[PDB]
Design a binder for this molecule. Structure first.
Ligand SMILES: [Ca+2]
Length: 223
């Protein structure tokens, strides 16, 4: 997250870190046994880390649970990043409380102008690299589809939305991928892609979760 603020420990209780020896992507806890992330974060050997603030220090609220099954969306296209969504089943159920909690799925899609909360452990610089140990947060609005398509001609599908600031300076970034965009208490986006980070006229692009609720629910019911 570029241009954000320190969230505070366990203030984003649905945020998870995906770990394969190191943090590599975010995700969101959607019930006690399932996480949603970005398909471009797929790899084998995932440990899901819940209850984290500092990802390099054991602070006392963590739960570390291996994945038993990963399911990339049937229609994910790695060249265009269309359908950039993946479900991860935990080997055992997490223990839910105030500091580790699920986020609800949306019943309707959010409109442009809605303010959302984006969070992650990704790069904090638009030039150069500095990776934080503690969770960072950013409040940002959903942009109109027309603004989004203007910024990225030929690249925005119906399964994507833009959020952020056309003036630059505030955005998600590398290492935030897979993490949540929460608006009015519902998961509306997944950190997916952008051109650089926090550049003028290049806002972040997010997977539009409301298009996937049926697939999510059906998949969880059968796996
Ligand atoms: Ca920790």
């Amino acid at each position: 997250i570029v241009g954000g603020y320190t969230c505070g420990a366990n203030t984003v209780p649905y945020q998870v870190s995906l770990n394969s020896g190191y943090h590599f992507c975010g995700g969101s806890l959607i019930n006690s046994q399932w996480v949603v992330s970005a398909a471009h974060c797929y790899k084998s050997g995932i440990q899901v880390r819940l209850g984290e603030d500092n990802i390099n220090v054991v602070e006392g609220n963590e739960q570390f649970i291996s994945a038993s099954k990963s399911i990339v969306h049937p229609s994910y296209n790695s060249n265009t990043l269309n359908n950039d969504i993946m479900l991860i089943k935990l080997k055992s159920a997490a223990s839910l409380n105030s500091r580790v909690a699920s986020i609800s799925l949306p019943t309707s899609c959010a409109s442009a102008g809605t303010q959302c909360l984006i969070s992650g452990w990704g790069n904090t610089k638009s030039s150069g690299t500095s990776y934080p140990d503690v969770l960072k947060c950013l409040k940002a609005p959903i942009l109109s589809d027309s603004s989004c398509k203007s910024a990225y001609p030929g690249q925005i599908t119906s399964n994507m939305f833009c959020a952020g600031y056309l003036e630059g300076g505030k955005d998600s970034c590398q290492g935030d991928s897979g993490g949540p965009v929460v608006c009015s208490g519902k998961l509306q986006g997944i950190v997916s892609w952008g051109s650089g980070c926090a550049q003028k006229n290049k806002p972040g692009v997010y997977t539009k979760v409301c298009n996937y609720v049926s697939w999510i629910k059906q998949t969880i019911a059968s796996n």
